[PDB]
């Protein structure tokens, strides 16, 4: 999961 | 299991193993020592391979055996790299301990993912003497279970405490307000 | 099949099954598992004698593994209301709360034949479900085990600290045994 | 086997004391038994009470509430003694006979609680089932109140979860009368 | 079903009429409620005439022990002599019932058969429990050996070397070892 | 279901107060112990009149089979038997161990005859032991056998290794029933 | 079973000579149906003696118990098939007194060979399948006996399932007639 | 239990009371044989009643109680209370004409024969044929006592058919609906 | 057995099982019942595609009954988090939680084939228990099919309230139904 | 299993780690003995790691491992991961003193043998007389590794025994909680 | 599941195996019996001078699959050394006191458990005949072997395998079933 | 779990690693699969060389007849010896392939055991279907006992008194009874 | 029970 989780 | 390709020269994977290569790790269904230590190990290594770089939890789980679980907690908290969690779909019980235990502002609900708390269950069977010492122990678990809650969601032991003698649910937006998650994962 | 038998009154012979023959006679059999329909049935017996005669000794004979506690315990609290004495005897075995229900009859008159044999113990359980149920079912019975151990004490005479002591695992107790311990007062010979 | 006696089965010769046994699990037709035998002591003195001795863990709630709508209806006061546990609808049961006239044996015990249910199916029929246990928790709540003289409110807090009470303290609650002691 | 049938003085089933000249039957295997209903008889005839001979006929492979050891008892409290008649098998605990008779009242029909052997038994558990369970059933096997010897007259020495493991006897055999006091003939 | 006569008796019964036994199916302690039950109280009736034994039987426990034979070899009574449809194994034999002169085959009837059948499962010691005992009861069946049939011993034998089936003329060919019954 | 002026109705029936042979054929079942037809012969050796027929069939060797001792007793036995008579069933229907075995208009027959089964060593095999292929014999010849039928014909016509309706049953000779409304 | 009054069956036996009910199988069966034929001997001239609750089941069983039924010289009147379906409508129909009932609510199906074999071909045969007389001899007799014409049973009955109690009058099945 | 089949790169020859093979065209397959392993392996397969290449469509081919309720939302909840327009294609049928991913699809890229068919209706649940429980457990399936109908209504165009009225019971779609309903956009025509 | 080419377990055996999962018995143990076996042929001076989450089991199988443990030359460090419960516990408690780890919420429990056997009374007792000889083993090996007196060990496991990660410290049972 | 180590990749056994060692595990059956033949014959084939182990955790079990090891071991040129871990019971302690003289081990807390052979049989009593007396000729072999392995009487050896019997190590090299222990 | 071995490199299961060495393996209940296996490996061992003698070791209670006629007409029809070695026990249809080797080729191991009987069948039907199977069955044993006084050397009369019933021979005894020609000694 | 229930 990016953008940020990653 | 698909498999893909990582150009590296080029090789194959099952695709679990292609996301734990960038140190991702699925937590999926009922929580229980075999996926458990499947779990821990592979904390262990993405640790030995990058002391400090971030490791990602994806959750999916309606929970399970209490200790199993606990093998996961502590290797979380011990392990050098922040474990990012992100919950999709459910992290119930044990899945929504381990959600809350993910490192402080990288803890994720996806957001029409849901959230349920509870008690510890448990059950004995035998002399009256092994009840107490079996319901006695079931107690300080229940006691170490919400102390924890309580520190990872800034709430109060008391407040915890009561919002878990049944069970509970929070959306993605409660489980925010609630603490137990930093923030809903947006686009 | 329950053999019949020719009862001789005085208003001409009659059949009764053995069993309703022999509580006739004011014997009645504590047999089997201990639980809500055999203990009930018990007790209606039990009022049905005292009503026929409130002086008269009853007898109640046990052969029981033991069973259910609170069961056990309509037993008891009605052979201690009524006014009869209820003399028990111990054949082939009284377990648990049989054993309990033998050292309950009226002083003097509890026996154990030469080849019974008695174990003593404390409450089995058993709950399935959250903490704080467990805890609840947990606290009660150790009330339970509490109150029977009392109850124990003061049926034998032996201290509380000696009742709980001895019934923290299973406990044999020869016939000759239990009367020194005084949970039963003789052995029936010939 | 039940014993005959001098010729009655010994249940039909208590009956004639007017003393009916509720014995074990509270379900439609052991029930309608008890209904049956409520109405036909009526019949056969309308002015001498009846005695209900129960020894139970209770059981289904609408077959125990045929039981205490009869016993409520009929003339006789509707004596309860409470032998070895009357759990749930049996405890239920036992507090709802004529006040004054409910006892426990010196170490019969009591237990209380909520309703138990449980449906499956479409959201919109669990939603009905749901309301209507709530419903049923409600009335079974308030009545409670009723025969033991407590507040709704404290049986509300005594009822969400299983509850014992030893003779004495089901004295003191007001679920019984008094305790039953030797001739 | 149980044929019936009539006395000229009653109406009887034939078990029921044969307990009325005071034969008891022991069937099969040893249980908690088939030696209470034997009891039970047995208590019956005692109070309808003391005085009288009570008769056993056993035809069983054995069972529980304390089932069993509740008749036993119960013949020897009982004022009436208990004979004892073997047919087809007495084995085990119906063997030693067999053996309890009356002293000369025993008997073995000529084709029945004997077996004796030693307790049998099981617990699981706890190791503290194991031994508690272990040293009970020891107890109850020297108990028994001993009423063995004592009805046989047999030395109990000899009664221990031969029950360690089933051991069959005829009905010959039985009177020769002290079993039975004869064999019924003709 | 079995059916009431009137002299009010079931048909067993009623038959029974002709001295009139039946042997039904398998044999085992319990039919085993009823037969016995009945020849005794017949003896008691009238030693001296005859009892009768109908058998159709596919046989069974060997021990139960043998409280029957001997009560009936210990009985004033002759017991005089009938082989209806089949008398296999301990069928047969309780047959052939009638009152010589009246036992009898019903002319469809058939009789099967073969060696015991046995099990045990345990140490070698306690295998050896219980062979022993069976091969000891063969021996024994098979004396039997021969005196009631006139038969000798190892032809007893050698015609029992296997199943071996008698149709009812060669039953009386072979001394096992006396004669077949005709109308 | 209903009650009459008391007998259950079976026993009602029996009285009048009336026995019924219902369901599957077996040991208990025939040894019964044997009882009452000897109380029957005891009561009346000259009166007709009837046999109602609903059944499948069965076993053999019970069958052959009832066929037996309705050859062997003095009344005449006289047949009736309701609903079905198939097998052993049908066999003892045939077996009825001649001129004296009805068929109701809709019920039907069935005639076949024995079936049969063994597990086991191929010497018990061959002994087994000897004597089923004996008492295939018999059967055929009793079923030509009764019908008229030649042996070869009886062969013939039962090595596969055999249907017959009532006027087809009383052409083959296995009845004597269709019982109708009659006046 | 059954309630004590005579047990309550048997008390309405005495006043020619028969009760069908349930499956129909060999002993239910041979016991409303067993009813009839006693009635039958008690008085050969008073009308019988068949009160019929029925899904159905045997056919063999049906026809066993059908046969009686046209034998006995009583008059059979049959009374359909709840249902009547398959072998129960059968033998419902097969009451003595004009004295055939149906309760206001009650309800009616007729359909064709059910089967099964398992076997070698030659065998299958065998037995399809039989169920396919006996499928005949239904039609044929439906056919009878209905007053429809065969070929109207035959197309009826290939698969399930319920009648209300107006149409099961209107079909002949019935002759009149029982009102207060 | 899953066959096996061969790729033709300059790297050299390869050989795929036929599904990984056709995830390398963006392909991904929702098959059978909806349940948290299938679903989280079809989480693994969008993420694995966004990363290879975040601008291209990916597609996810749904023949199924439905499911979990939350497991089809671990899908739901990637397919509108990650870049790529996921296109979803209805073979066979896509019943319950299968219709809901289905309408999910990007705008304008959701499509029926001809003799497909789909199936909405309300949350199935169930729950045994104590009163208060049954309570807390009914609520929240309230909450969850209030959900499922508001996106429901976002994803076709329908107002909230008639979709809460089509759903309540079973509702059967054709192809050209579900498209005049605004759940998919076209037909596959060929 | 994940792949990183070994599974993930083969990777971490390469770094001389070896786990103990779930219940004992004699595959999963002897297995455990071969790994043992093969560490030590590589190099019988470094350290070995044994990461131990299990409710215990089979006593027999666990003594492999014991004997295995002792024989060998490398240390044995133990680590107690969700659960170590009895044979568990015992072969936690049995690593190389100063490198028995416990993790902060991992929880430890301790009891005496349980068994079982049915058949005669001679053979009971012999079962019974070898099941005290194990229970009487296993105690003073307890003794010899926690530091506790033997009585201290039979006194404390005659019923189930929880210890928390510090108790099990206190406890002797292991050296200390694993942290940050 | 079953560690793989790399030397070319193995699993672990496979990887022992190498060093000539073969594990005896859980009950004796056919199959795992005939595995272990399979290994002993080509452990022989690569070198027939090299001390080849028998690495012993089992219950026992199948006595006909047992003797087809025993035989295999003692036709074989290689010493087959044993060793017994957690426990070698019945026919697990036979092939234990199987190995070469002076060869065969218990470690510290194995422990040792002999008996006599179980079967059981049903049917005819000629036939029953055949399969006891068929089963009292194994238990005489079996303590015959015994006896020759032990050193012990065949008297003494009846005498303590008539029932169940337990030594501990140290018993179980006094009563010659093993040569010594493994010490550390 | 197999264990893999290395040969001169290459990795096999150790069977096939046998199986390089003409020995294959008939292991536990005869039956169609293992039984194909069994005849594919002969077919295979006979193509790569004609000359050479294969060897097949037997472990088996026996099983089913057919099956194991399918691997006796393939070790008859290929022109390899195939020598036979008894290795625990070979039973009924392991006894039958066991003397099925080549003369001269065929052994016991000193401990191993062999057991003979005749056929065992079963069928349920039809007297006429019945007849026919029986007789079947009868024509098998037939042809099994004329092929086992083949081998063994002895009369086709023995051979039927000794199969009548189930009968055990020691690796001596086989010997003896010419059903091996030679116990394995080292 | 009686003194009062009945």
């Given at each position: 999961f990016s953008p940020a989780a990653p | 299991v698909p498999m893909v390709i990582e150009q590296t020269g080029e090789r194959?994977?099952?695709?679990?193993?292609?996301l734990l290569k960038e140190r991702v790790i699925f937590l999926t269904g009922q929580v229980e020592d075999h996926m458990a230590n499947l779990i821990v190990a592979?904390?262990?290594?993405?640790?030995?391979?990058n002391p400090e770089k971030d490791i990602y939890l994806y959750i999916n789980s309606p929970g399970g055996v209490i200790t199993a679980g606990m093998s996961i907690?502590?290797?979380?908290?011990?392990?050098?790299?922040?474990?990012?969690?992100?919950?999709?779909?459910?992290?119930?019980?044990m899945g929504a301990f381990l959600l809350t235990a993910g490192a402080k502002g990288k803890r994720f609900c996806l957001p029409n993912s849901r959230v349920?708390?509870?008690?510890?269950?448990?059950?004995?069977?035998?002399q009256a003497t092994?009840?107490?010492?079996?319901?006695?122990?079931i107690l300080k678990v229940k006691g170490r279970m919400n102390e924890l809650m309580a520190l990872h969601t800034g709430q109060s032991l008391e407040?915890?405490?009561?919002?878990?003698?049944?069970?509970?649910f929070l959306?993605?937006?409660?489980?925010?307000?609630?603490?137990?998650?930093?923030?809903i994962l947006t686009h």
């Open positions: - | 194959s994977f099952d695709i679990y193993s292609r592979q904390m262990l290594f993405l640790e030995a391979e907690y502590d290797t979380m908290q011990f392990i050098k790299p922040d474990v990012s969690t992100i919950c999709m779909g459910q992290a119930a019980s349920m708390i509870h008690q510890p269950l448990g059950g004995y069977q035998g092994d009840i107490e010492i079996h319901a006695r122990e407040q915890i405490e009561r919002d878990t003698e049944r069970d509970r959306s993605a937006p409660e489980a925010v307000e609630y603490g137990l998650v930093d923030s």
